[PDB]
């Protein structure tokens, strides 16, 4: 999101592609999962697509 | 002796026997003094209690070349049968077969020990009304009543959790993920939906396998409670 | 100097009060501009939230930061 | 009770005048006893076990909802409503230790008639429909 903010032009689309093979990145820690969920919700609200 | 065999047979769980394209439910209690066996096929019940002399005579007759004391024979029979009753798919050689007569049932067991043959026959006569009652009718009623009590307790727990969820919602908060919302629990609606939808597949006793697989700890608990008083 | 900030004289004026601090928190945390949290921080005196405190900005910021902070 | 039979004598007043009847029952065959008591009771036990499983799953889902609400920063106004997480093993152990004796008491048959009669009828009707 910070990288997106730095851009000074007008962006019609904003996209992130996540290349991974770990379906449960945080299985040991539940708090990290909740933080990730909150941040993902905020990013979706801002208008950032996540794939 | 006889009392010990009867009490032991009472305290044991049911086991499933696959034999010659058919199924049976069996309870066996074998001790050095004799043995007791109860067989069923969900239509009739059969019982056989045997002391030492009968075992020795039958062993001499069938196994012509075997010469062993009754205690050793019963121990070998226990070692042969218990593995199959406790758990199936065991790597043990034990073939079972059943015959029929006007009333009796002959259950034939063929196996090998040290690779040498070992035959036994159970001559089970139709079980007396008291035995069938005490082993199936009353324990099953106790199991049903216990499960009903469990259902009521779990319903009370659900009501408590419903009240707490209602309090949390009244506080004004919201879920981070909305898919977890669960509707309020009404006992009548749940029972109606169950009876309409899931009862046909839940009440199918089939050939006895579900009873052995699911309801055995409760059966043993109920029977043990009955033994005490 | 932190227990008694009102008596500090070496440091100049920060230049930031409730409103500027709310705007900076919205910018840095990358919160939605029209979301519930941003509106609560900006209009922190309106009791429409009905939760926490309707007059304390520090408590509102604390509630906002609770799920986003170590 | 004489020999293996049972004479059930019923006396009454039909319009104020005597009315007698005597049922002469003989011990039921193993098939009737089975089809009327044993198989339906097994069906009832299995159905109630399925009900218990469904309720356990519902409790697990409500635990998930409560965990989500707690994580979201929600604070409950009344602290007495907190309910401990449900563990099936612990609940079963506590039940079998404490409440099994009273629940399992068959008695003289009254509890069976009072509680389990709708399930009995449903299981018997399903058996009849099947064949």
Asked if C31 lies within 8 A of A42 by C-beta distance, the reply is yes
Strand duo B34-40 + B23-31: pairing: antiparallel
Residues B121 and B197 sit within 8 Å (Cβ to Cβ): no
In which region does residue B198 sit, left (phi positive, over 0), alpha (psi from -120 to 50) or beta (all else)? alpha
Chain B residues whose CB is inside 8 A of the D38 CB are: 42, 136-137, 140
Tokens representing B48?
């056989």
Tokens representing B17?
């026997």
Secondary structure in 3-state letters for chain D: CECCEEEEEEEEEECCEEEEEEEEEECCCHHHHHHHHHHHHHHHHHHHHHHHHHHHHHHHHHHHHHHHHHHCCCCCCCHHHCCCCCCHHHHHHHHHHHCHHHHHCCCCCHHHHHCCCHHHHHHHHHHHHHC
Strand duo B45-50 + B34-40: pairing: antiparallel
Close Cβ partners of D124 (under 8 Å, ≥ 6 residues apart)? D40
- Under 8 Å CB pairs connecting chains A and C tally to 19
CA D5, CA D79: separation in Å to the nearest integer?
65
Burial (CB < 10 A; 0-12, 13-18, 19+), residue B81, is buried
The 3-state DSSP class for residue A49 equals strand
CA A41, CA B12: separation in Å to the nearest integer?
57
CA atoms C11, C15, C19, C24: torsion sign: negative
Resolution in A: 3.1
Which long-range contacts does C52-60 make (Cβ < 8 Å, 24+ apart)? C57/C18, C57/C21, C57/C22
CA D95, CA D29: separation in Å to the nearest integer?
37
Asked if C67 lies within 8 A of A38 by C-beta distance, the reply is yes
* Whether B102 contacts chain C with CB within 8 A: no
CA atoms D91, D93, D97, D99: torsion sign: positive
Tokens representing A47?
């208008």
* Whether C66 contacts chain A with CB within 8 A: no
Min distance D84 CA to chain C CA atoms (Å): 23
List the subunits that have 3+ CB pairs under 8 angstroms with B.
A, C, D
Q: Count CB atoms within 10 A of the CB of residue D8.
A: 9
Identify which of B225, B229, B38 has the alpha carbon closest to the alpha carbon of residue B135: B38
């Amino acid at each position: 999101a910070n990288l997106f903010s730095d851009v000074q032009f007008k962006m019609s689309h904003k996209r992130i592609m996540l290349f991974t093979n770990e379906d449960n990145p945080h299985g040991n820690d539940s708090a990290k999962a909740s933080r990730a969920r909150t941040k993902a919700g905020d990013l979706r609200d801002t208008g950032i697509f996540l794939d | 002796v006889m009392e010990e065999l009867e009490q032991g047979l009472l305290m044991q769980p049911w086991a499933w026997l696959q034999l010659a394209e058919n199924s049976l439910l069996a309870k066996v209690f074998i001790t050095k003094q004799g043995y007791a066996l109860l067989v069923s096929d969900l239509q009739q019940v059969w019982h056989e209690q045997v002391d030492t002399s009968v075992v020795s005579q039958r062993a001499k007759e069938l196994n012509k070349r075997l010469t062993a004391p009754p205690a050793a024979f019963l121990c070998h029979l226990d070692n042969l049968l218990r593995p199959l009753l406790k758990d199936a798919a065991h790597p043990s050689e034990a073939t079972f077969s059943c015959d029929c007569v006007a009333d009796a049932l002959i259950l034939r067991v063929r196996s090998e020990l040290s690779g040498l043959p070992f035959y036994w026959n159970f001559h089970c006569m139709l079980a007396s009304p008291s035995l069938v009652s005490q082993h199936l009718i009353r324990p099953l009623m106790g199991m049903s009543l216990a499960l009903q009590c469990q259902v009521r307790e779990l319903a009370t727990l659900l009501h408590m959790k419903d009240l707490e969820i209602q309090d949390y919602q009244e506080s004004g908060a919201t879920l981070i993920r909305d898919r977890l919302k669960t509707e309020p629990f009404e006992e009548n609606s749940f029972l109606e939906q169950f009876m309409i939808e899931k009862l046909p597949e839940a009440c199918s006793i089939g050939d006895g396998k579900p009873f052995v697989m699911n309801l055995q700890d409760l059966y043993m608990a109920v029977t043990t409670q009955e033994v005490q008083v | 100097r932190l227990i008694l900030p009102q008596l500090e004289r070496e440091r100049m004026a920060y230049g930031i009060k409730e409103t500027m601090l709310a705007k900076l928190y919205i910018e840095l945390l990358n919160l939605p501009r029209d979301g519930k949290d941003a509106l609560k921080l900006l209009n922190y005196r309106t009791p429409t939230g009905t939760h926490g405190d309707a007059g304390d900005f520090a408590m509102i910021a604390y509630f906002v930061l609770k799920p986003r902070c170590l | 009770c004489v020999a293996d039979a049972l004479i059930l004598r019923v006396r009454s007043e039909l319009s104020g005048l005597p009315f007698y009847w005597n049922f002469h029952c003989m011990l039921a065959s193993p098939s009737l006893v089975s089809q009327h008591l044993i198989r339906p009771l097994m069906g009832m036990s299995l159905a109630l076990q399925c009900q218990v499983r469904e309720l356990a799953t519902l409790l697990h889902m409500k635990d998930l909802e409560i965990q989500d609400y707690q994580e979201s920063g929600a604070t409950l106004i009344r602290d007495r409503l907190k309910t401990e997480p449900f563990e099936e093993n612990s609940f079963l152990e506590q039940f079998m230790i404490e409440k099994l004796p009273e629940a399992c008491s068959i008695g003289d048959g009254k509890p069976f008639v009072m509680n389990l009669q709708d399930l009995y009828m449903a299981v018997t009707t399903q058996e009849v429909q099947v064949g």
